[model samples]
Target chain A: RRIEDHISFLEKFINDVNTLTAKLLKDLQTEYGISAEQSHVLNMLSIEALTVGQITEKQGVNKAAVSRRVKKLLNAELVKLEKPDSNTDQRLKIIKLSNKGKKYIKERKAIMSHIASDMTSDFDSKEIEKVRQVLEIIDYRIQSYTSKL
Target chain B: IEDHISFLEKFINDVNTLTAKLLKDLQTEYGISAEQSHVLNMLSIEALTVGQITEKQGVNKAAVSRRVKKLLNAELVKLEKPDSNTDQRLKIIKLSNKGKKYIKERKAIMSHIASDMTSDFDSKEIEKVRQVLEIIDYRIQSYTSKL
Candidate 1:
């Protein structure tokens, strides 16, 4: 009974958090112009341009999937592929943001900040902080585990 | 350390499966996947990295990546690359106003769940559960440091 009850609690928590996060993602999309994958790649490039392999490691998608997604974004002109990292073929190309991409990132941060600020309007700072900490723990544990593979 | 970390992999996978199922139920009961809802939350924040998201939500990277793509297909969010100043490999994701409106609708579903749980359950017991969960979560994060 004790273990079963604990499982129940786990189920409820998982459900609540999942639903909440999904809604959160949708909310972000409602206010933005690009796809989340494109944004993710763009953000990866923002920190430091890396080969597709590195992006795949962080993004967690297979080569084919990332390759396909990149093709779409490239077609749209949101990102550019450069050979700065590779010596020979373009297959080793790196992804970076164009001038337009930079402007998009700036505006995106402001808007996203506005929304984040609004969501916490009802929570106390302690509650908000607790929530943030809890989420980070969950996030870290997930990454730590996956890194092993 | 690797052995210690193995347990976390199982725990996280278990949690993720449970989470995915719950969100799937919520979406079935309401409409929309958990990822879609999460995008709303991310958009609600300042523009963020996929890494930051992985850190925040504790979801799988592939899952996050695919979900983001779906959001983009729906034309709800915008994806862009930052300038060369930072990291060239980074990708930035944000929301469209339409995505924001979508989030508002989804929150109605969430509010229902919250009200039901809070109103129907023993609030004190739920509070205790939350507290225990906090402890378990703390242990999950810091166990590696101890190793």
Candidate 2:
């Protein structure tokens, strides 16, 4: 019974979070004229320029989907892909953020910080700190398991 | 300085990946999406109208209608006239015996996935995580309400 309750609690928690995040994604799409999937690709490139294959591997999505998203990003001028000299595989394009993409990331960061502040407004500093710590532990353990897979 | 924001972002990404994989696995095993399974679970408790399902799921009417239609087609759920006390046009959703059986198996599968995911954590740790999740969810609701 205890285990079942815990599972249900976590399931509800995940659903709530997804709902909130999806709403935020919709907001981003409406305001910035970018799809959530395209934003995901841009965000990945913000961390570092990567090949389509690398984005596919990191996002755990298929190659075709990543390529399709990349195409949209290319059309939007949010990302630029460069072909490496001496590389036979034309499919291996290195994706990097453009100047405009950098600006959008900055604006997104501000909006996200605003949201983050509101999310923690109900909790104390200590509780907020502890929550982050707990999340880190959970992420680390999840990563350990995912690695094995 | 340690980038706490980046940490939070990574945490959300990991959770999304894990949840997506779990749903995909459930779809493969049960021939039902996670959302469909949730509707079935709701019906197992008691019959509800389409509006009730929409409100409970926090989703739009069209999405609920699609899921209900799929469930009805699969013979896992049945639609009946609302009780005589209510509007005749109102349809109540009830789980068929097959749905009850499907829900039972799906519950087991969900529990198994939950157990597998949390196998490394102790009960106390699990409770602590749950409490934090409640706080976060509350914050999310509070933010959404304000908007």
Candidate 3:
């Protein structure tokens, strides 16, 4: 009964978090003109440029999917393929952000920070500080399991 | 030891990141696109029209239609149109037997996840966490619903 009741709590927590994040993604799409899949790539690349293989490892999706995302990014002028010396047949697939992407990232962070502040506004600082620590622990556990999965 | 990082963003962003990873695992394990799996899960609950599903996800028509088309090609879902019983033809999408069985296993894996994620945490940890989550969820839910 303890485990069963615990599952219910955990399940609701999962749903709550998912519901919030999806709404944020919707906001990103609406207020900012980003797609769901595109945000995964753009958000990862915000910190640094990486090859498609690196992104495949980081994004947890296959190459073809990332390839399509980059294609769309190219069309949108948000990202450019790394210039190859040879411009050789096919070339290495290193993706780097454009100046436009840099501009967009600035706007995105402000919006995200705005939303973040609102979400956290209700909590006492020390109280939230404690929960994030708890989350960090759970996140570590989840990472180990996720890598294997 | 670090000090005073962004509160709540870490958890929400972390959860979003993990959610994407879990969906990818679902994609690979089930041999379907992750987007397709989303449709399947929605249909697993109840039949939805292409228009209805599009509205639910609040994504562009192209994105939703493409995934629905792909799922149809895979035979994981089939389209049903009310057969001349109505003035306007309303098309609905529902899961196939294969799709139903797919979700059954997928949901079982999800069950494993809930257990595994909560593992090693004491009962008090969760009891404590839930109250905080409820508090956070309250304003967060209200904020999103308004937009």
Question: Candidate 3: lDDT over CA atoms?
Answer: 0.66
Tell me the lDDT of model 3 at B10. 45
Please write out the lDDT profile of model 3 over residues A55-145, one tens digit for every residue. 7755455668777787888888888877545545564667888998877766666666677676666568888777777878777766677
Residue A76 error, candidate 3, Å: 4.6
i-RMS for every candidate (Å) is: 13.4, 3.9, 4.8
Q: What is the TM-score of chain B alone in each candidate?
A: 0.50, 0.60, 0.63
DockQ of the two-chain complex in candidate 1: 0.03
**TM-score leader:** 2
lDDT of 2 by residue, B1-147 (tens): 126666766776776565545456555556786567767866776678876665455544577789999999998897876556348345888998888877666567567766776677688866776787787777776665444
Say which prediction, candidate 2 or candidate 3, comes out ahead on TM-score: 2
Pitting candidate 1 against candidate 3, the one with the higher TM-score is 3
What's the TM-score of each model vs. the native? Answer: 0.41, 0.72, 0.66
For model 2, name the residue pairs that clash: none
Please, what are the lDDT tens digits per residue for candidate 1 over residues B28-137?
Answer: 44345555665555555456666655544544567767777787787778775557333734467777787766655545544443343344345465565477555544
Q: For model 3, what share of native contacts is present?
A: 0.27
lDDT of 1 by residue, A1-149 (tens): 33334434454444334333333344444354456566656656765776678776454433687787777767867678777643656446677877766666666555444544453355465654554455355455444544543
User: Between the candidate structures 1 and 2, which one is better when assessed by DockQ?
Assistant: 2
Model 2 chain B: weakest 10-residue lDDT segment is B19-28
Candidate 2 has a DockQ of 0.37
